Design an enzyme around this catalytic site. Structure first.
Site, PDB file in Angstrom:
ATOM      1  N   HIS A 210       0.858  -1.202   0.000  1.00  6.18           N
ATOM      2  CA  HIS A 210       0.000   0.000   0.000  1.00  6.18           C
ATOM      3  C   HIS A 210       0.897   1.256   0.000  1.00  6.18           C
ATOM      4  CE1 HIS A 210      -0.205   0.377   4.745  1.00  6.18           C
ATOM      5  NE2 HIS A 210      -0.064   1.620   4.372  1.00  6.18           N
TER       6      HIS A 210
ATOM      7  N   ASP B 227      -0.829  -6.245   2.356  1.00 10.32           N
ATOM      8  CA  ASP B 227       0.010  -6.951   1.372  1.00 10.32           C
ATOM      9  C   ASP B 227       1.471  -6.490   1.502  1.00 10.32           C
ATOM     10  OD1 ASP B 227      -1.786  -8.720   0.108  1.00 10.32           O
ATOM     11  OD2 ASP B 227      -2.293  -7.310  -1.548  1.00 10.32           O
TER      12      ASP B 227
ATOM     13  N   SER C 203       4.113   2.192   8.533  1.00 16.57           N
ATOM     14  CA  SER C 203       3.800   1.022   7.690  1.00 16.57           C
ATOM     15  C   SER C 203       5.038   0.598   6.892  1.00 16.57           C
ATOM     16  CB  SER C 203       2.680   1.359   6.701  1.00 16.57           C
ATOM     17  OG  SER C 203       1.420   1.296   7.351  1.00 16.57           O
TER      18      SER C 203
END
Lengths: 228, 228
Positions: free
Chosen positions: A41, A89, A183
């Site tokens: 992402h 993912d 992230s």
């Protein structure tokens, strides 16, 4: 990282900053001399420009002799990445060349046995993400120790309502938690990479919405093939 | 283990005791659900008998709920292992079935990046080997923290004079050391397997003759090929 502390100078040499036109975008973890693991992402929102990986850094803005920027030759998704699976993912980034390793730059072995980390285990999450909800961005690398939350509790209707699958794991988000810009960063337990921060647009520091990390053991065969 | 102390029971879930006709012969480390890493010579050179590996143990004699004996289906010594050397002293043993994993039995990730461990690094070695020069054997698992010694110093003519190959590493042995019966066991640094106690007659606890360990990073490809 919310409710964290500044990490020790270069105590986590596998820690990478995936950058977009010279600005920190997401975290990453050096997994081989020429490969960095991150969140898919992350590359999707990568504005429109030069994606690079910064290794050997502590401070994002101060010169440091171990700091080195590499270009990403390519990004390799896994078999079932699609429109709807992209939040949690993984993505393997291949550097323009083999990273120069040393005391401030070193790959981290990942877990290759598909077995869940025991609930309550304290794992370390590091990153240069948001330090408060108002969006204060830190300069130096931050980190926190977060206990692993058992999937059963994480899937309660009050928590993540069944969204946590076998390829994901949770950690408690009671004040201490990963957030925006963290992230793609590592979740390390016992000196082994166990998960990768895959926060998405999740609210931070709310105990009812635990942090989500996708399990690298689940993708061990795939990481293996692409690195070999 | 010399100058060590009793390890906290089942705190090292990856430790294995390679046994010959019911008695402890060598140390070993669980690296996969159905495979244990050890030293080739420790096994190859001993007297005949049935070889089994004991998992989930602390005490070698007391019953314990996590303790389990496994038969060996086959042994795969390193192809270049020879009776006249300590080079390539690695052995892979395949268990009769996949080990039942749990809190007290769990494989340990190993180093796949070839790389040396920085000298000075504190690594942990555990084993049921000899606890004194007399040859006394413990009932419970012992361990000792040893600093890694750089290869140049180790190769001095006063130490191991040339003997240490690029795939060997040393650790200091000043009154603290691994000894007879500790061969095949794990030298763990930062929670990841770095070396395997080498076989070979050597005095223990003599600071002038450092402990030699086989670097597993130099054998990653071979290990991977046998485990596939």
């Amino acid at each position: 990282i919310l409710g964290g502390r500044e990490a020790e100078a270069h105590a986590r040499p596998y820690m990478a900053s995936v950058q977009l036109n010279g600005a920190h975008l997401c975290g990453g973890v050096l997994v081989a001399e020429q490969w960095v693991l991150s969140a898919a992402h992350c590359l999707e929102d990568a504005a429109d420009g030069k994606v690079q990986v910064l290794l050997g850094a502590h401070s994002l803005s101060q010169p440091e002799p171990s700091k080195r920027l590499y270009d990403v030759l390519r990004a390799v998704p896994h078999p079932d990445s699609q429109p709807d699976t992209i939040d949690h993912d993984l993505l393997l980034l291949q550097l323009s060349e083999k990273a120069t390793l040393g005391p401030a730059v070193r790959p981290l072995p990942w877990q290759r046995v598909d077995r869940d980390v025991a609930p309550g285990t304290l794992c370390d999450v590091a990153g240069w993400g948001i330090v408060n909800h108002a969006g204060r961005r830190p300069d130096s690398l931050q980190h926190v120790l977060l206990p692993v939350l058992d999937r059963a509790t994480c899937n309660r209707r009050t928590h993540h309502d069944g969204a946590i699958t076998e390829r994901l794991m949770c950690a408690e988000s009671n004040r201490r938690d990963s957030c925006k810009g963290d992230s793609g960063g590592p979740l390390v337990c016992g000196g082994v990479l166990e998960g990768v921060v895959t926060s998405g647009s999740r609210v931070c520091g709310n105990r009812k919405k635990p942090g989500i990390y996708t399990r690298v053991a689940s993708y061990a065969a795939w990481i293996d093939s692409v690195l070999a």
